[PDB]
Design a binder for this molecule. Structure first.
Ligand SMILES: [Li+]
Ligand SMILES: [Li+]
Lengths: 115, 115
C-alpha cells in the first residue's frame, strides 16, 4: 500500500532502451548529452528527474570505455549493459509519478526522433 | 528495461490507503463514490484510469459486506483489506505514467481533504 502520510519518499526508476536497432545510425548519445552535456543538464532541470545515459557507447569513446571496463571498478559496471537512459525520481506519490511522467515523456521525444 | 517499440503495454497499479486514522469520521467512501457512484465515474473518465474503492467499509453497509465476506467468494476477498483506493492504468510508458500521475494527483485531493 501507499500511505500518503508516511515520512518515506517514493522512488521511481526506469531504464529505457535507446532504440539503436530501430535507428542504427542516429547519434542518440550526442543528441541527448548535447554540447558539453548541456542538453541533458537542461533536461534534468526542466523535469526535476535525475537522468543518465548508461551502457555501451554511453561515453562516445570506444577506447576510454574499454579501459574503464577493464579496470573492474564497479562504478563502470554499467558499460556492459545495453545503451539506455536511466530515469530516477523520488518524492511523495503524486509528485513522484508526475515527475516520472514528465521525464518519461521528454525522454520519449528524444528516443523516437522521427515522431 | 522498457522497450518503447515493444507491443506490450505497461501496467501501473497502486493501492492508496484511505487515511481513516488521520480523519476518523470523514466519509471518504461517500465522498469518493458520490451519489449513485457518479463522482467515481467522472473521476475515471477524467483521468482515464480504472479506480475502485476496496477493503472493509468500501460498500457502506456493514451487514451486506459481512454477508458477502462469509460466502467465501474470491471476488469479495478484498473486503478484508484495509480501506483503500485501487488505481490501474495501462499503455505505452509515457501514457501510462501520465495517466497514473493524473489519477494519483486527483485521488490525493480526495484523500487529503483539508489540504
Ligand atoms: Li522510423
Ligand atoms: Li488534518
Amino acid at each position: 500500500y501507499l500511505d500518503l502520510f508516511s515520512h518515506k519518499n517514493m522512488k521511481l526508476k526506469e531504464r529505457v532502451l535507446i532504440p539503436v536497432k530501430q535507428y542504427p545510425k542516429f547519434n542518440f548519445v550526442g543528441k541527448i548529452l548535447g554540447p558539453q552535456g548541456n542538453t541533458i543538464k537542461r533536461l534534468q532541470e526542466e523535469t526535476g528527474a535525475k537522468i543518465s545515459v548508461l551502457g555501451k557507447g554511453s561515453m562516445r569513446d570506444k577506447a576510454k570505455e574499454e579501459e574503464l571496463r577493464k579496470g573492474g571498478d564497479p562504478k563502470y559496471a554499467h558499460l556492459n549493459m545495453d545503451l539506455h537512459v536511466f530515469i530516477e525520481v523520488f518524492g511523495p506519490p503524486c509528485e513522484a509519478y508526475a515527475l516520472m511522467a514528465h521525464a518519461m515523456c521528454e525522454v520519449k521525444k528524444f528516443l523516437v526522433p522521427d515522431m
